[PDB]
């Protein structure tokens, strides 16, 4: 029998995690990674989406925006800054790439050290236990394995409209853009769309977001709106209820000049403006189509493209497994994939019975004002637990760090969502403020311990720190009490 | 009487209890008075945290950080010129401007909630009777059914000469009318290192004189790492020395002073000269001269603390004590607020809810910040028995530093687990940026008796410093390498 115990299709966050984990148990392991180029032909190394065109470059470019904010603040803390400092897109994306690059090389090294076989090729199933590896130039080799991990993730979706593929960029492209994007239209309004609009605007560019329906579908809608309001108040332009119909090159250039024409969601009306870059951040389809799943009979959701999967990450075909984003009804987040992948390797070759817990996974939208949250949204706790069974403690706050710069009072906002039928279990947690990620993490662990509101209250705050607001959340939404206004002192 | 309740001290605990008691419609009075420092410094309503503690300390910390932030911004593409300079006066001006609005916020808040504010020193004269010596000297005599002693502490000096007339405390630093210049900081707990940290961080020549160990009371390994970090980023350390005398070599703003220090064990002597000497060497409670004899409140004579029931009651049943002046408690603001707020609940609202002093999270705001909650490594060994303790720990590198390309493998996290208890995380520690924000949540997680296997089942947030705690697999006992790093493996 076979060439490897395990072949992982995809060298992503989930891929490399399972890969690197399976190696502790001394087994023949192979990773296939291959970066199918974007429309305008962009490439990148081992590491997957987070490393190359996701969290890593996105956070870094976020930080670049924050740091501009930081420079503005420094005046009032006594730093003799000259009047305005300017931003250099090239210098920035260069450092980002320099870090991405070392991550790429880090993983290629890490695989070698753990003795995993790396093959930079496209994996396509050809028959039971048999995969074809089409390498970069065209040559194919055929490999076999006892088990398989499908960990191929997704890629940005385009609109069904013309001009979009040849003239627009996706998340995949922005992060290595060889020129300042200039005036930008970002189309779509979930984490990627707003995050990107947020940092582009933050480094000084003229940015507009074109919203089809609601902001951040799926996330607590009140929080979403506050994020939107914040973004608008800090110089991001919003075009509400419009979809683009065509993108046409009015010039070539780096950046070019493009013309976007958009129809209304309900009226008949038409708008035209012209931008330097159009960012299409409008969802992502799974790479499950062209991996030759037919030839081994893995069932996939035909409509969505996701792979349904047992609570053990097993596909309908018993030797084949799926990990990460391509899974159905899961969270498409990196730490999830890593965990899932790492724990799957435990089960297979280490005899752990520990499953992957997909419940109450914390997330953070890295909008200019960051939004971190964990558990259920207000509407969903109402839906799940019955309206007047839900109690919501909430409040605004002002990071001490902003007082001296004297800006943005009463913009930061925290709330816990509590289940009255359950000892006020904090079944929902939300915070809109700086370092939202850091704040949330702890409480997510606290949620895994089934935290109750009265336990939260018995926990003493840390002062002066943003997260302490959660220790003293006394005003309920139901109670109607004023939460503004403020004061500071009372 | 005249009042249901008189709160002696308008501090964190004071104003908290005061503002809380007001909901229950009672005649309340706050006496606050700021007894001036040796060199005669004053401030408004709000207490230590507001005027000469957390508020101005964090702000000045932030100023330091922002300098770091400017340095970093170059590699993120900001066309900074080569070096930006700092202006002490412009800084301490903004800080005061904020402190000022806080003063004039609490004064309003008391008025709105209808509490009576009297800016006067409170001294007990007999049962249910207090004397209020106002600022100019006139006294009035008030009465109340109950009393809250909420007087907090003040910086202690060394028993040596020159120190009162030539040195500054925490109390003075935060309104210093001139750039402190080259500084010696004496002492090595939160105040000493925090201050040394931000002073150096805004560009000054800073030396810390350590008597024994760093941060006595806090996990000593973390303390040392804090020390190492501070030294690696340009803070000078004089280990095992106490100053014997401080003598003015000049008057000036800043002056020029000569510090002479003896060794902890050897006979040796050192001399240097600094512009400012910051004495951060403990604080004594203001329990002495509040006329406690005249109402017979027992105080620990040795320490000055007020022993108190699990309900913040002193031995005298109508008299209560809140916050820092309490014996065997934490001297932290949120604690005093909570204690005070909850005491007012019991008295006038019939809540039976006590104040939980267990596993109060704290944060040392040293340049590399240190947050922690629960037991230290030595104390969990001591309390729970050496080989019953398992420690999962690891270094990390905030993504934010990779581009500026600095300070890999400096940030460090550990949980302390009790093997006799399902690996209860009875100890939590993190050295890294935004430590405060990181810790808070986990403190709540500890109050829920978090176990290591629950921590593990919790998914991380990426890329975020705090996620390190979700994946702490290497044990200290196991001996595994935690350096080195990589990033990718
Ligand atoms: C702009 C952006 C920002 C994001 N921000 C965050 C964030 O802040 N925090 C967070 O937790 N998550 C974030 N995410 C989501 C995150 O990228 C994913 O959750 C994560 O990368 C998924 O890992 P994976 O292994 O499932 O898929 P991927 O990481 O995408 O791994 C799949 C890899 O395999 C390759 N491949 C595909 N088909 C084949 C094949 N047939 N043969 C060989 N190789 C193949 C792919 O090209 C890719 O390299 C972000 C995503 C984007 C796009
Ligand atoms: C430099 C420094 C940094 C600190 N940083 C932090 C931090 O980051 N986080 C944190 O949680 N804690 C911090 N603290 C500790 C914090 O200051 C205390 O925990 C908190 O202020 C105590 O509140 P309190 O009401 O107990 O005392 P205080 O706030 O001191 O209140 C006492 C008030 O009453 C006045 N008074 C005294 N005697 C009388 C009298 N007889 N009559 C009338 N008035 C009187 C005092 O002058 C003072 O105004 C810091 C302290 C210092 C010095
Ligand atoms: C990874 O996730 P992600 O953030 O990339 O996306 P995602 O979370 O899958 O959701 C798609 C986002 O793009 C929007 N969108 C989808 N098709 C669109 C279209 N034709 N025109 C305008 N907006 C469209 C969605 O708005 P809707 O809520 O209106 O679908 C939503 O804001
Ligand atoms: C609020 O707390 P805080 O941070 O102000 O202080 P604190 O936590 O009460 O502790 C006092 C700090 O100052 C030091 N100290 C006390 N007396 C000293 C002396 N005579 N010479 C040098 N150092 C001395 C202590 O070191 P030791 O641990 O050596 O006592 C400790 O570092």
PDB file of C-alpha atoms in Angstrom, chain A residues 20 50 55-56 59-60 63-64 67-68 70-71 73-81 85-88 91-92 95-96 99 103 106-107 110 202-203 335-336 339 357 361-362 364 366 400-401 403-404 435 437-446 448-449 451 455 457-468 471 488-490, chain B residues 19 49 54-55 58-59 62-63 66-67 69-70 73-80 84-87 90-91 94-95 98 102 105-106 109 201-202 334-335 338 356 360-363 365 399-400 402-403 434 436-445 447-448 450 454 456-467 470 487-489:
ATOM      1  CA  UNK A  20       2.918  20.092  10.998  1.00  0.00           C
ATOM      2  CA  UNK A  50      -4.050  34.682   5.964  1.00  0.00           C
ATOM      3  CA  UNK A  55      -4.941  38.710   8.215  1.00  0.00           C
ATOM      4  CA  UNK A  56      -1.230  39.303   8.056  1.00  0.00           C
ATOM      5  CA  UNK A  59      -3.552  43.834  10.067  1.00  0.00           C
ATOM      6  CA  UNK A  60      -0.227  45.403   9.043  1.00  0.00           C
ATOM      7  CA  UNK A  63      -1.556  49.319  11.861  1.00  0.00           C
ATOM      8  CA  UNK A  64      -0.199  51.745   9.245  1.00  0.00           C
ATOM      9  CA  UNK A  67       0.021  54.845  13.266  1.00  0.00           C
ATOM     10  CA  UNK A  68      -1.078  57.892  11.274  1.00  0.00           C
ATOM     11  CA  UNK A  70      -0.901  57.979  16.450  1.00  0.00           C
ATOM     12  CA  UNK A  71       1.138  60.734  14.823  1.00  0.00           C
ATOM     13  CA  UNK A  73      -2.287  62.380  18.726  1.00  0.00           C
ATOM     14  CA  UNK A  74       1.359  62.831  19.603  1.00  0.00           C
ATOM     15  CA  UNK A  75       1.157  66.617  19.345  1.00  0.00           C
ATOM     16  CA  UNK A  76      -0.974  66.968  22.452  1.00  0.00           C
ATOM     17  CA  UNK A  77       1.195  64.530  24.396  1.00  0.00           C
ATOM     18  CA  UNK A  78       4.051  66.974  23.726  1.00  0.00           C
ATOM     19  CA  UNK A  79       5.800  65.595  20.644  1.00  0.00           C
ATOM     20  CA  UNK A  80       6.899  68.505  18.482  1.00  0.00           C
ATOM     21  CA  UNK A  81       5.568  67.064  15.228  1.00  0.00           C
ATOM     22  CA  UNK A  85       3.330  63.742   7.730  1.00  0.00           C
ATOM     23  CA  UNK A  86       2.773  62.077   4.363  1.00  0.00           C
ATOM     24  CA  UNK A  87       2.298  58.432   3.502  1.00  0.00           C
ATOM     25  CA  UNK A  88       4.227  56.390   0.962  1.00  0.00           C
ATOM     26  CA  UNK A  91       7.459  51.893   1.134  1.00  0.00           C
ATOM     27  CA  UNK A  92       4.583  50.371   3.120  1.00  0.00           C
ATOM     28  CA  UNK A  95       7.752  46.152   4.311  1.00  0.00           C
ATOM     29  CA  UNK A  96       4.553  44.120   4.410  1.00  0.00           C
ATOM     30  CA  UNK A  99       7.341  40.162   6.289  1.00  0.00           C
ATOM     31  CA  UNK A 103       6.590  33.861   6.502  1.00  0.00           C
ATOM     32  CA  UNK A 106       9.460  30.149   7.323  1.00  0.00           C
ATOM     33  CA  UNK A 107       6.811  27.562   6.451  1.00  0.00           C
ATOM     34  CA  UNK A 110       9.211  24.382   8.989  1.00  0.00           C
ATOM     35  CA  UNK A 202      -6.576  55.910   7.225  1.00  0.00           C
ATOM     36  CA  UNK A 203      -3.353  56.256   5.182  1.00  0.00           C
ATOM     37  CA  UNK A 335      -7.488  30.091  14.312  1.00  0.00           C
ATOM     38  CA  UNK A 336     -10.513  27.805  13.668  1.00  0.00           C
ATOM     39  CA  UNK A 339      -7.351  24.260  15.657  1.00  0.00           C
ATOM     40  CA  UNK A 357     -15.449  23.268  19.379  1.00  0.00           C
ATOM     41  CA  UNK A 361     -15.609  31.375  18.450  1.00  0.00           C
ATOM     42  CA  UNK A 362     -14.585  35.035  18.973  1.00  0.00           C
ATOM     43  CA  UNK A 364     -12.731  40.754  15.314  1.00  0.00           C
ATOM     44  CA  UNK A 366     -10.603  45.443  12.159  1.00  0.00           C
ATOM     45  CA  UNK A 400      -8.190  57.487  28.467  1.00  0.00           C
ATOM     46  CA  UNK A 401      -5.768  57.628  25.527  1.00  0.00           C
ATOM     47  CA  UNK A 403      -8.796  62.524  26.361  1.00  0.00           C
ATOM     48  CA  UNK A 404      -5.537  64.457  25.834  1.00  0.00           C
ATOM     49  CA  UNK A 435      -7.534  46.940  20.654  1.00  0.00           C
ATOM     50  CA  UNK A 437      -9.102  41.911  19.709  1.00  0.00           C
ATOM     51  CA  UNK A 438      -7.125  41.941  22.945  1.00  0.00           C
ATOM     52  CA  UNK A 439     -10.183  42.893  24.987  1.00  0.00           C
ATOM     53  CA  UNK A 440     -12.407  40.131  23.570  1.00  0.00           C
ATOM     54  CA  UNK A 441     -10.057  37.082  23.841  1.00  0.00           C
ATOM     55  CA  UNK A 442     -10.226  36.729  27.599  1.00  0.00           C
ATOM     56  CA  UNK A 443     -14.029  37.061  27.714  1.00  0.00           C
ATOM     57  CA  UNK A 444     -14.338  34.397  25.002  1.00  0.00           C
ATOM     58  CA  UNK A 445     -12.526  32.036  27.366  1.00  0.00           C
ATOM     59  CA  UNK A 446     -14.872  33.394  30.059  1.00  0.00           C
ATOM     60  CA  UNK A 448     -16.488  28.902  27.439  1.00  0.00           C
ATOM     61  CA  UNK A 449     -16.766  28.830  31.227  1.00  0.00           C
ATOM     62  CA  UNK A 451     -19.913  33.277  32.444  1.00  0.00           C
ATOM     63  CA  UNK A 455     -19.909  36.600  38.053  1.00  0.00           C
ATOM     64  CA  UNK A 457     -19.904  41.955  38.211  1.00  0.00           C
ATOM     65  CA  UNK A 458     -17.878  40.250  40.982  1.00  0.00           C
ATOM     66  CA  UNK A 459     -14.773  40.576  38.752  1.00  0.00           C
ATOM     67  CA  UNK A 460     -12.829  43.752  39.520  1.00  0.00           C
ATOM     68  CA  UNK A 461     -11.806  46.034  36.639  1.00  0.00           C
ATOM     69  CA  UNK A 462      -8.267  47.030  35.593  1.00  0.00           C
ATOM     70  CA  UNK A 463      -7.836  50.819  35.562  1.00  0.00           C
ATOM     71  CA  UNK A 464      -7.407  52.727  33.410  1.00  0.00           C
ATOM     72  CA  UNK A 465      -8.044  50.231  30.658  1.00  0.00           C
ATOM     73  CA  UNK A 466     -10.808  49.982  28.074  1.00  0.00           C
ATOM     74  CA  UNK A 467     -11.880  46.390  28.911  1.00  0.00           C
ATOM     75  CA  UNK A 468     -12.770  47.328  32.542  1.00  0.00           C
ATOM     76  CA  UNK A 471     -16.896  44.808  34.974  1.00  0.00           C
ATOM     77  CA  UNK A 488     -16.199  60.844  33.269  1.00  0.00           C
ATOM     78  CA  UNK A 489     -17.114  61.501  36.870  1.00  0.00           C
ATOM     79  CA  UNK A 490     -20.344  60.553  38.509  1.00  0.00           C
TER      80      UNK A 490
ATOM     81  CA  UNK B  19     -22.417  58.937  44.519  1.00  0.00           C
ATOM     82  CA  UNK B  49      -5.838  58.138  40.838  1.00  0.00           C
ATOM     83  CA  UNK B  54      -3.480  56.208  37.265  1.00  0.00           C
ATOM     84  CA  UNK B  55      -4.840  59.036  35.170  1.00  0.00           C
ATOM     85  CA  UNK B  58      -1.255  56.269  32.069  1.00  0.00           C
ATOM     86  CA  UNK B  59      -1.310  59.493  30.082  1.00  0.00           C
ATOM     87  CA  UNK B  62       0.960  56.847  26.504  1.00  0.00           C
ATOM     88  CA  UNK B  63       3.240  59.774  25.604  1.00  0.00           C
ATOM     89  CA  UNK B  66       3.570  57.420  21.114  1.00  0.00           C
ATOM     90  CA  UNK B  67       7.279  58.123  20.785  1.00  0.00           C
ATOM     91  CA  UNK B  69       4.813  54.707  17.656  1.00  0.00           C
ATOM     92  CA  UNK B  70       6.572  57.530  15.735  1.00  0.00           C
ATOM     93  CA  UNK B  73       5.794  54.501  11.521  1.00  0.00           C
ATOM     94  CA  UNK B  74       8.828  54.831   9.187  1.00  0.00           C
ATOM     95  CA  UNK B  75       8.750  51.179   8.118  1.00  0.00           C
ATOM     96  CA  UNK B  76       4.956  51.300   7.730  1.00  0.00           C
ATOM     97  CA  UNK B  77       5.612  53.969   5.129  1.00  0.00           C
ATOM     98  CA  UNK B  78       5.245  57.279   6.969  1.00  0.00           C
ATOM     99  CA  UNK B  79       7.732  59.832   5.695  1.00  0.00           C
ATOM    100  CA  UNK B  80       8.872  60.904   9.144  1.00  0.00           C
ATOM    101  CA  UNK B  84      11.047  64.162  16.717  1.00  0.00           C
ATOM    102  CA  UNK B  85      11.741  65.840  20.055  1.00  0.00           C
ATOM    103  CA  UNK B  86       9.576  65.884  23.170  1.00  0.00           C
ATOM    104  CA  UNK B  87       8.317  68.895  25.135  1.00  0.00           C
ATOM    105  CA  UNK B  90       3.338  70.899  26.517  1.00  0.00           C
ATOM    106  CA  UNK B  91       2.758  67.335  27.766  1.00  0.00           C
ATOM    107  CA  UNK B  94      -2.451  68.574  28.453  1.00  0.00           C
ATOM    108  CA  UNK B  95      -2.426  66.039  31.290  1.00  0.00           C
ATOM    109  CA  UNK B  98      -7.573  66.597  31.571  1.00  0.00           C
ATOM    110  CA  UNK B 102     -11.983  65.527  36.045  1.00  0.00           C
ATOM    111  CA  UNK B 105     -16.459  66.881  36.767  1.00  0.00           C
ATOM    112  CA  UNK B 106     -16.645  65.305  40.212  1.00  0.00           C
ATOM    113  CA  UNK B 109     -21.408  65.213  39.791  1.00  0.00           C
ATOM    114  CA  UNK B 201      10.490  56.708  26.976  1.00  0.00           C
ATOM    115  CA  UNK B 202      10.018  60.453  26.411  1.00  0.00           C
ATOM    116  CA  UNK B 334     -11.430  49.686  40.802  1.00  0.00           C
ATOM    117  CA  UNK B 335     -11.305  47.766  44.141  1.00  0.00           C
ATOM    118  CA  UNK B 338     -16.386  48.421  43.936  1.00  0.00           C
ATOM    119  CA  UNK B 356     -14.848  39.963  46.305  1.00  0.00           C
ATOM    120  CA  UNK B 360      -8.292  40.997  41.451  1.00  0.00           C
ATOM    121  CA  UNK B 361      -6.414  41.576  38.195  1.00  0.00           C
ATOM    122  CA  UNK B 362      -3.665  44.229  38.182  1.00  0.00           C
ATOM    123  CA  UNK B 363      -1.491  45.872  35.504  1.00  0.00           C
ATOM    124  CA  UNK B 365       2.405  49.787  33.066  1.00  0.00           C
ATOM    125  CA  UNK B 399       2.555  41.209  14.578  1.00  0.00           C
ATOM    126  CA  UNK B 400       2.794  44.986  14.971  1.00  0.00           C
ATOM    127  CA  UNK B 402       7.509  42.556  12.691  1.00  0.00           C
ATOM    128  CA  UNK B 403       7.531  45.386  10.174  1.00  0.00           C
ATOM    129  CA  UNK B 434      -1.909  46.405  25.868  1.00  0.00           C
ATOM    130  CA  UNK B 436      -4.413  45.536  30.566  1.00  0.00           C
ATOM    131  CA  UNK B 437      -6.914  44.820  27.819  1.00  0.00           C
ATOM    132  CA  UNK B 438      -5.579  41.269  27.411  1.00  0.00           C
ATOM    133  CA  UNK B 439      -5.924  40.384  31.102  1.00  0.00           C
ATOM    134  CA  UNK B 440      -9.415  41.770  31.971  1.00  0.00           C
ATOM    135  CA  UNK B 441     -11.355  39.045  30.106  1.00  0.00           C
ATOM    136  CA  UNK B 442      -9.219  36.276  31.582  1.00  0.00           C
ATOM    137  CA  UNK B 443      -9.808  37.680  35.058  1.00  0.00           C
ATOM    138  CA  UNK B 444     -13.514  37.239  34.418  1.00  0.00           C
ATOM    139  CA  UNK B 445     -12.585  33.777  33.078  1.00  0.00           C
ATOM    140  CA  UNK B 447     -13.908  34.076  38.444  1.00  0.00           C
ATOM    141  CA  UNK B 448     -15.631  31.296  36.467  1.00  0.00           C
ATOM    142  CA  UNK B 450     -11.317  28.467  34.248  1.00  0.00           C
ATOM    143  CA  UNK B 454     -11.492  24.896  28.759  1.00  0.00           C
ATOM    144  CA  UNK B 456      -7.621  25.118  25.089  1.00  0.00           C
ATOM    145  CA  UNK B 457     -11.147  24.553  23.706  1.00  0.00           C
ATOM    146  CA  UNK B 458     -11.437  28.375  23.302  1.00  0.00           C
ATOM    147  CA  UNK B 459     -10.436  29.469  19.784  1.00  0.00           C
ATOM    148  CA  UNK B 460      -7.908  32.326  19.348  1.00  0.00           C
ATOM    149  CA  UNK B 461      -8.408  35.699  17.637  1.00  0.00           C
ATOM    150  CA  UNK B 462      -5.830  36.264  14.879  1.00  0.00           C
ATOM    151  CA  UNK B 463      -3.659  38.177  14.605  1.00  0.00           C
ATOM    152  CA  UNK B 464      -3.896  39.388  18.225  1.00  0.00           C
ATOM    153  CA  UNK B 465      -1.494  39.143  21.128  1.00  0.00           C
ATOM    154  CA  UNK B 466      -4.039  37.545  23.473  1.00  0.00           C
ATOM    155  CA  UNK B 467      -4.546  34.499  21.258  1.00  0.00           C
ATOM    156  CA  UNK B 470      -5.457  29.680  23.541  1.00  0.00           C
ATOM    157  CA  UNK B 487       6.677  32.271  13.384  1.00  0.00           C
ATOM    158  CA  UNK B 488       6.127  29.232  11.227  1.00  0.00           C
ATOM    159  CA  UNK B 489       6.529  25.657  12.371  1.00  0.00           C
TER     160      UNK B 489
END
